[PDB]
Amino acid sequence: EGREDPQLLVRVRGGQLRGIRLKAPGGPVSAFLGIPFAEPPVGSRRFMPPEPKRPWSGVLDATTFQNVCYQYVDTLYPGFEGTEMWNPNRELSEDCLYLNVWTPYPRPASPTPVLIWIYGGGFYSGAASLDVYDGRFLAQVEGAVLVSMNYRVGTFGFLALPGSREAPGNVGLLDQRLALQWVQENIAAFGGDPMSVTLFGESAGAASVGMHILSLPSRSLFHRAVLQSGTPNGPWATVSAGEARRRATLLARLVGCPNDTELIACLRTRPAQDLVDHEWHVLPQESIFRFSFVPVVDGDFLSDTPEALINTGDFQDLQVLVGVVKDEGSYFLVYGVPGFSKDNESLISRAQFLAGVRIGVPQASDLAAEAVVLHYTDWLHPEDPTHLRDAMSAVVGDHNVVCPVAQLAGRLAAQGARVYAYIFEHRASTLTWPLWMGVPHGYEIEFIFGLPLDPSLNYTTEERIFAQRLMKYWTNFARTGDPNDPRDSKSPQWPPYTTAAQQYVSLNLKPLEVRRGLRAQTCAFWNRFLPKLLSA
Amino acid sequence: EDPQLLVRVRGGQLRGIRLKAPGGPVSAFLGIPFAEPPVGSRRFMPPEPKRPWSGVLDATTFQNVCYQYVDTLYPGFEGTEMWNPNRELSEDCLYLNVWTPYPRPASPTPVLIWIYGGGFYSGAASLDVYDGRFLAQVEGAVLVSMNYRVGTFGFLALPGSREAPGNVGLLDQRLALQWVQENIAAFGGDPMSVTLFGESAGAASVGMHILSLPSRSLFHRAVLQSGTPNGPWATVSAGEARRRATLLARLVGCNDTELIACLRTRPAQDLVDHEWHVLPQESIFRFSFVPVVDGDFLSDTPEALINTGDFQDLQVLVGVVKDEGSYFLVYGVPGFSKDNESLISRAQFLAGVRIGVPQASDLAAEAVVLHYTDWLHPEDPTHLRDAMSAVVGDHNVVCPVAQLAGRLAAQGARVYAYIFEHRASTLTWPLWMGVPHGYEIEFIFGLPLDPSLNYTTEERIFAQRLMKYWTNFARTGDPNDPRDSKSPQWPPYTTAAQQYVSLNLKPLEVRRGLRAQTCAFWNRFLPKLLSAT
Ligand SMILES: CCN(CC)CCNS(=O)(=O)c1ccc(Cl)cc1
Ligand SMILES: CCN(CC)CCNS(=O)(=O)c1ccc(Cl)cc1
Ligand SMILES: *[C@@H]1O[C@H](CO)[C@@H](O)[C@H](O)[C@H]1NC(C)=O
Ligand SMILES: *[C@H]1O[C@H](CO)[C@@H](O)[C@H](O)[C@H]1NC(C)=O
């Protein structure tokens, strides 16, 4: 060194790093991208827990994003921004255990609250390097220290032969945990406060945040949590040990690998792409919103099912922010369900609805499916194709996201937690998906991260103000455990969610509005009745 | 000797009585025998036609009420006593009543035939609320009402036997209908225009005449108020009927013939004493002796018959009151009383549901609980109270009615549907009960026209509106005024639009869907759940 920006040279436990000075609309920020936090989980390390990165020599260049974890790439609508924004934007590799840090420039002298993003993508996809997860705006505008990590997905992260030494399960969650431990030890070098760490994530990332809440070894690694449109409880976020074993062994057969030791050793000789090419062939039924390789109830990371853990747990020390978007189900109707497409109005017949219900609730008996159909049908217009399309969307959204979120919010509050809840109702002026899909799963994210502040992105002026409001809620929550700004106590307050009043707020261009009951009637069906009907 | 009050029917001469209605005189012929007294060896047997009589038969007074259980609930309270027998109890009770304008109509007049309700265990055509003088005077109607046997005397059945074949109370009604066909012209009635109307079990009876072929030549249109032949209480299987009669005979100390011969030796009150001890579960809105699916009067279950019937030339008017279930909570559900606001707890609600839906499995009962709970306010006592009432009213009345209306319309019938929403200013029951089962009746019969009863002037106008709908329906099969214009018209109920009207102090308002979501639960889902549980 000698002639470089002195603000971009930082030492961490593993060695020296050189970051990059980035431009945000309001000024510069420091970014340290592609910092290794584990040994590359390759070869004999495939399917194994991550090992901490061994120290390196010299100055590691941390100026670009590292590889994306090897993963299936969505083929729906090539070239279309609505899908492409979620696709990997760096080389796919099994050597992908790297994290990213954004801080103000120059770095703060007083220790700053840290936000850690965990991406979603159904546990089969995602990357910390996507444009929508760009930490520069939260760092510049709110002065946050923002961290995001890559973690293994698909078979590489979640293929499990439970009980085995060579594929114990949940290693993608152990990748996340290792990154949290890296933050505890190192974030002070960047001006971050390791004693104020807030996790946030969306969809499977939210499910992940939920796992860390429920897993004792993660508890010392963060202080507050935000779960956006996802939960550890619910029908897709976990599988039993038996089901994980069945899926792993079928996958092994499909790629020519028919003792766990021998099976796993044969799996390790397979090219990454071979595993990806068969990953979707192991689901027990035709389905949507079901993913082959997800966290497993192993009796270790998860000592019991998340449902059980949230029923009995003491959550007195927990402050949590949770919520959903207006149209959780709509995105998913195109991927499976005859009659749907982003390219037509997707009006469907009653026949397509009945068939869609079997696909959207693949675990349902005939009787359970009838109950669903009966509840969601408009008996004044039982064959109206607009209503049926919207009802199909509501079925998928409620079953997979809204009611699991309502259930989580309810259990946490009853057991000590401080809970704030929201519904996100603003549809981006820039959205490329058709109007009937409303505010789909994932489309609050660009607002939380403050992308509308980028003038080149063509958001309206009101959307910029809106984005700034949300960034304030999120960072207020991270700082204090309360999304409300003191010294603004005239602005409408966001009351905590309680079992008694069930209050949540609407997030849109208008001032906060308080509502009561998170789909209360309908969620009673999914959360109280349906389990009893399935058990008969 | 007023010659307006002297009539010859097939059995002989009758002398009626000139009555006063608020707007002029009416002729009444009360206590006309239509059958041989069903006593002694005729107990439990089909009715036989009345033998002819000599001289002039005195028809100036109401005859005996059919022998029946009398309600003990709130002694001396008008809300209950208005339904109790107002003449002496007797097994000798097969008499009918006729009201006509005075003087006798010069042209043949549409006939309305009233069939009282009372759970098939009680009721009488002599009750004040069934007074036909107002309809006769104001609308010029010829109004007929009959007594029919109730309880064991009307419905005890050993299906297959000769001596207790079942449904004889329905056969009493049918014999009275036959009597109308044969004799009503002598009063100025038109036997080619006969409209049955009835409430609760009376409405269920009307529905059974619709479903029974020999009845179909005896009337032309029907009104069903708050009751239906389909549904959970109005019929029993032959096996359950046989079980109940066999149990009753055991309880009083008694081969079909020998069993029935012994029952016939028992004084009437001994049968009544054990009438309520034969129900299979603790329950409400369930009655021991009701019409039986015999393969005779009823060729199959009402549900099967309304599903497959051809109802092309049928016109029907059907409806419900706003609070069908509220009356019944006092009768079995712990926590309910006319004397306090009956705010109940959640546990009382869960227990209430097992009583109100006695055939429900644990899982079915939980479905009901979870459907009717307001999950925004799950423990709120006033909601739980109102939910309890809705459960009982929807299960026993509202949803069976929606089902019947839908089936009849889909299979060719002309159907008109209503919800009756006006609470009488004079109502003696507490406010929380709203507009209870049975409280549209006094309005249809025109009681507010009686100044000594202190109804408001609005209620008097409302009453006249309803008498018009009912009599227009009787005359034409359509309750709308034939020439008195003005939107809003009352549109036919159809499966597509599902339109019905609200009957209250305001002008007709058209609504769509009779509790559609909730009735889909009762009518489509619950049967599936019960079958597989
Ligand atoms: C996390 C960002 N996502 C939200 C838009 C993009 C798509 N991934 S997903 O997990 O929602 C998903 C969607 C459809 C199917 Cl079929 C499977 C998974
Ligand atoms: C005739 C209209 N009724 C006015 C409500 C009179 C009361 N008898 S009942 O059939 O309604 C009845 C009473 C109690 C129970 Cl439990 C069931 C039915
Ligand atoms: C209403 O009245 C009855 C007794 O008359 C009682 O059982 C019920 O609990 C009362 N409601 C109150 C005061 O809780
Ligand atoms: C919006 O900005 C201009 C139109 O003024 C257009 O050329 C550009 O492509 C748009 N940007 C995006 C990212 O949509």
Side-chain angles (χ1 to χ4, degrees), chain A residues 1-486 488-489 491-536, chain B residues 1-161 163-482 484-485 487-533:
Chain A
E1 79 192 65
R3 212 67 90 164
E4 332 187 32
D5 196 336
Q7 262 288 301
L8 299 177
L9 305 177
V10 172
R11 176 177 289 277
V12 296
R13 178 62 181 83
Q16 292 192 291
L17 303 166
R18 170 172 35 250
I20 186 170
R21 178 190 146 131
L22 301 177
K23 297 171 203 166
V29 299
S30 306
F32 298 82
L33 312 170
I35 306 171
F37 65 87
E39 287 293 301
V42 300
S44 64
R45 287 166 155 82
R46 185 189 282 177
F47 313 121
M48 297 293 286
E51 294 170 337
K53 172 66 172 177
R54 299 192 301 259
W56 57 87
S57 65
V59 180
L60 182 142
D61 186 89
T63 70
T64 64
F65 288 115
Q66 263 287 0
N67 298 323
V68 172
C69 294
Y70 214 97
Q71 65 192 247
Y72 176 83
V73 175
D74 182 89
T75 65
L76 186 76
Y77 309 142
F80 176 57
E81 198 157 285
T83 49
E84 290 295 354
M85 63 186 292
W86 306 111
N87 285 341
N89 65 339
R90 307 258 76 190
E91 179 179 335
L92 301 181
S93 170
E94 287 183 81
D95 176 5
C96 62
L97 296 187
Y98 301 88
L99 57 81
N100 311 294
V101 179
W102 289 263
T103 73
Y105 181 103
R107 299 191 306 271
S110 64
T112 302
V114 179
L115 289 168
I116 304 181
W117 179 249
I118 304 179
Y119 56 77
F123 292 114
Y124 71 86
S125 62
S129 53
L130 308 182
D131 283 4
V132 286
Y133 310 145
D134 187 343
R136 80 183 67 198
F137 311 97
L138 287 163
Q140 208 282 320
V141 179
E142 291 299 331
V145 167
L146 195 128
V147 184
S148 57
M149 86 292 285
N150 285 352
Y151 61 92
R152 288 170 279 174
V153 292
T155 58
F156 312 94
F158 298 97
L159 180 140
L161 291 163
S164 74
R165 182 199 124 250
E166 305 93 337
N170 295 329
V171 304
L173 295 172
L174 294 172
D175 296 338
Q176 296 169 13
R177 171 178 291 159
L178 183 57
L180 307 194
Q181 296 170 335
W182 183 98
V183 170
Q184 283 299 293
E185 169 158 29
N186 299 292
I187 205 63
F190 299 86
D193 186 357
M195 282 158 62
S196 176
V197 172
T198 299
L199 310 186
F200 68 138
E202 185 271 350
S203 203
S208 295
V209 166
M211 319 257 65
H212 294 294
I213 291 173
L214 300 174
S215 191
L216 180 49
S218 292
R219 310 291 260 284
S220 55
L221 308 170
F222 68 103
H223 308 86
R224 279 169 295 281
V226 184
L227 291 80
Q228 307 173 204
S229 302
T231 57
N233 49 299
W236 53 268
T238 60
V239 287
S240 67
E243 177 67 4
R245 179 163 286 275
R246 188 196 67 82
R247 293 178 190 190
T249 81
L250 179 55
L251 182 95
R253 288 188 196 103
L254 292 178
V255 302
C257 299
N259 212 338
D260 287 343
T261 295
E262 308 183 19
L263 188 145
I264 298 159
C266 163
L267 278 182
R268 295 194 306 261
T269 69
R270 297 301 179 250
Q273 190 67 45
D274 278 12
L275 305 188
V276 171
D277 291 347
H278 292 93
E279 162 174 29
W280 292 104
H281 296 144
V282 301
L283 290 174
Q285 313 91 12
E286 180 178 19
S287 54
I288 53 173
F289 223 131
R290 296 296 184 267
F291 319 108
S292 306
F293 296 94
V294 301
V296 56
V297 181
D298 55 348
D300 186 16
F301 198 102
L302 294 177
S303 61
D304 201 348
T305 68
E307 277 85 350
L309 296 181
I310 73 174
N311 288 347
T312 69
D314 185 37
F315 300 105
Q316 288 169 32
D317 293 326
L318 185 69
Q319 303 152 104
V320 74
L321 167 55
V322 306
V324 296
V325 301
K326 190 167 130 286
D327 300 272
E328 294 286 357
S330 61
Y331 199 102
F332 284 82
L333 301 189
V334 49
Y335 279 114
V337 180
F340 291 87
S341 74
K342 93 126 145 79
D343 290 321
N344 50 33
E345 274 291 306
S346 312
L347 306 192
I348 56 164
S349 66
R350 180 146 192 89
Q352 290 169 315
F353 176 62
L354 304 184
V357 164
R358 305 316 297 265
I359 294 174
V361 195
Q363 78 273 25
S365 64
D366 291 25
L367 184 49
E370 278 188 34
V372 173
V373 161
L374 264 276
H375 183 92
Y376 282 83
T377 288
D378 180 346
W379 296 99
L380 271 189
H381 305 98
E383 310 210 272
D384 187 273
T386 300
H387 174 266
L388 291 166
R389 168 250 272 157
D390 293 344
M392 186 65 248
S393 171
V395 166
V396 172
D398 293 347
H399 177 44
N400 292 296
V401 180
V402 184
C403 299
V405 168
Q407 173 76 355
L408 177 68
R411 300 321 295 245
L412 261 31
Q415 291 150 17
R418 175 116 59 82
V419 183
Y420 295 88
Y422 67 82
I423 176 170
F424 182 94
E425 290 188 323
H426 174 76
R427 178 189 165 99
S429 62
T430 57
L431 201 59
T432 52
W433 293 101
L435 250 145
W436 68 260
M437 288 173 167
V439 182
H441 197 58
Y443 285 88
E444 85 284 24
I445 300 173
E446 57 200 69
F447 289 92
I448 306 304
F449 274 84
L451 272 70
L453 275 37
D454 183 341
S456 76
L457 296 187
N458 303 316
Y459 289 87
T460 69
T461 294
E462 305 86 80
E463 286 176 314
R464 305 193 170 100
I465 295 161
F466 183 49
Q468 294 180 267
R469 272 180 60 219
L470 296 182
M471 302 165 74
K472 276 254 156 46
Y473 291 143
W474 261 240
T475 54
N476 283 352
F477 177 74
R479 285 184 284 263
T480 67
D482 188 332
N484 296 287
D485 185 23
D488 186 20
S489 204
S491 272
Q493 295 299 286
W494 186 339
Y497 181 91
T498 58
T499 127
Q502 297 173 77
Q503 299 179 106
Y504 62 101
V505 298
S506 53
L507 297 181
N508 56 44
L509 301 187
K510 294 157 46 186
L512 281 195
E513 164 184 312
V514 177
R515 305 183 185 161
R516 300 185 62 253
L518 228 326
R519 294 265 222 279
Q521 277 320 101
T522 285
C523 287
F525 166 75
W526 295 102
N527 300 339
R528 305 175 185 263
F529 181 68
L530 236 235
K532 294 173 185 295
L533 183 57
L534 286 176
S535 132
Chain B
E1 191 82 353
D2 197 336
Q4 284 293 320
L5 299 184
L6 252 170
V7 178
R8 169 169 270 90
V9 296
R10 287 193 190 174
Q13 291 182 268
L14 296 166
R15 177 162 46 241
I17 178 168
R18 186 185 133 115
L19 290 187
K20 287 179 187 180
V26 306
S27 302
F29 303 89
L30 311 176
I32 308 173
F34 67 87
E36 288 296 278
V39 304
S41 80
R42 297 312 299 189
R43 179 187 284 174
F44 310 126
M45 293 297 283
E48 294 153 332
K50 173 76 177 73
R51 296 173 303 112
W53 59 85
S54 68
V56 186
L57 186 57
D58 177 69
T60 63
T61 190
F62 284 116
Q63 267 284 345
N64 295 322
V65 167
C66 290
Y67 205 94
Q68 62 189 247
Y69 178 83
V70 174
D71 191 72
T72 65
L73 182 56
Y74 293 119
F77 176 57
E78 203 199 274
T80 48
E81 296 286 357
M82 65 185 290
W83 308 112
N84 288 334
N86 62 344
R87 295 299 187 281
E88 292 285 308
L89 302 192
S90 181
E91 278 180 86
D92 182 350
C93 64
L94 295 185
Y95 301 85
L96 57 75
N97 312 295
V98 181
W99 288 269
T100 78
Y102 184 110
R104 197 169 309 169
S107 63
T109 312
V111 182
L112 283 77
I113 303 183
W114 177 248
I115 302 180
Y116 57 78
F120 297 109
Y121 71 87
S122 65
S126 52
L127 304 185
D128 294 347
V129 285
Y130 307 150
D131 192 333
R133 83 219 279 149
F134 308 102
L135 285 158
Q137 204 284 319
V138 176
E139 287 300 332
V142 170
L143 198 121
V144 183
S145 61
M146 87 292 285
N147 282 356
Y148 62 91
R149 282 172 284 176
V150 291
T152 59
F153 313 96
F155 301 95
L156 185 137
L158 283 305
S161 71
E163 40 281 303
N167 299 328
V168 306
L170 294 169
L171 297 172
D172 297 339
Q173 296 172 9
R174 174 179 288 163
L175 184 56
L177 269 38
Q178 255 146 21
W179 185 97
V180 168
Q181 283 302 298
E182 296 169 318
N183 296 292
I184 209 63
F187 301 86
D190 182 1
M192 285 192 299
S193 185
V194 173
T195 303
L196 308 188
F197 69 139
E199 186 268 356
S200 203
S205 297
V206 167
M208 279 155 213
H209 292 292
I210 290 174
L211 300 175
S212 191
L213 186 60
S215 282
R216 292 298 268 116
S217 60
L218 306 177
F219 68 106
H220 310 92
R221 289 170 276 292
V223 188
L224 293 77
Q225 307 171 202
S226 303
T228 61
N230 45 304
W233 53 270
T235 58
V236 288
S237 71
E240 179 66 4
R242 172 168 297 272
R243 191 193 65 78
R244 296 179 187 184
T246 308
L247 179 53
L248 180 87
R250 179 213 210 164
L251 299 181
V252 303
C254 297
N255 177 263
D256 284 342
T257 300
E258 300 181 36
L259 195 152
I260 292 150
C262 178
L263 282 170
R264 291 201 305 258
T265 64
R266 293 291 185 276
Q269 189 57 38
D270 295 350
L271 302 186
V272 176
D273 280 340
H274 291 286
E275 183 177 354
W276 293 108
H277 300 154
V278 302
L279 284 170
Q281 306 91 19
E282 185 185 355
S283 53
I284 57 174
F285 221 135
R286 292 297 181 267
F287 315 111
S288 297
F289 304 92
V290 300
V292 60
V293 178
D294 52 350
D296 193 351
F297 198 100
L298 297 178
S299 61
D300 202 338
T301 72
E303 281 80 356
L305 296 177
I306 72 183
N307 285 348
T308 65
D310 178 44
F311 300 105
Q312 284 181 36
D313 291 308
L314 179 62
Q315 300 109 34
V316 206
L317 170 60
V318 297
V320 298
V321 301
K322 187 174 129 289
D323 300 282
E324 291 288 357
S326 71
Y327 196 103
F328 307 92
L329 305 176
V330 301
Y331 279 111
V333 194
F336 288 88
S337 163
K338 90 174 186 61
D339 286 329
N340 54 37
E341 266 145 13
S342 312
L343 300 184
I344 62 172
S345 70
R346 182 140 183 98
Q348 290 179 300
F349 176 62
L350 308 199
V353 166
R354 310 312 305 259
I355 303 310
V357 195
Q359 0 76 243
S361 59
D362 292 284
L363 180 59
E366 296 198 63
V368 172
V369 166
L370 305 188
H371 182 87
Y372 278 86
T373 292
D374 193 332
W375 293 101
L376 303 150
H377 310 113
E379 299 263 0
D380 174 76
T382 133
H383 176 79
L384 291 170
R385 181 245 274 145
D386 291 341
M388 190 60 251
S389 168
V391 167
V392 171
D394 293 345
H395 175 47
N396 294 292
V397 182
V398 178
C399 298
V401 162
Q403 177 169 85
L404 178 72
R407 296 321 296 227
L408 295 184
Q411 290 139 229
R414 195 134 173 88
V415 179
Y416 294 90
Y418 68 83
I419 181 175
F420 183 93
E421 296 190 321
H422 177 73
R423 182 182 158 100
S425 59
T426 55
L427 192 57
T428 58
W429 293 99
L431 267 171
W432 72 260
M433 292 174 57
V435 188
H437 195 67
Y439 289 88
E440 84 280 26
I441 298 179
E442 59 201 62
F443 291 90
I444 307 299
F445 275 86
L447 267 69
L449 273 55
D450 186 346
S452 78
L453 301 174
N454 305 327
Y455 287 88
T456 69
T457 71
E458 292 306 279
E459 278 171 331
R460 178 189 66 84
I461 292 164
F462 180 48
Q464 297 179 268
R465 274 183 53 214
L466 300 176
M467 298 171 75
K468 251 286 181 306
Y469 291 143
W470 261 242
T471 58
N472 284 329
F473 179 76
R475 290 179 280 253
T476 65
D478 182 338
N480 293 284
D481 261 273
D484 298 32
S485 175
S487 168
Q489 298 293 106
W490 186 338
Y493 181 89
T494 60
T495 54
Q498 300 174 55
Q499 298 162 292
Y500 62 107
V501 301
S502 54
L503 296 182
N504 58 36
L505 297 180
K506 310 181 225 142
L508 285 190
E509 155 180 317
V510 178
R511 297 175 192 166
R512 293 179 57 176
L514 200 38
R515 303 269 242 274
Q517 295 306 118
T518 289
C519 287
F521 170 80
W522 291 102
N523 295 341
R524 296 168 192 261
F525 181 69
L526 255 225
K528 249 94 176 185
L529 185 52
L530 293 172
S531 106
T533 211

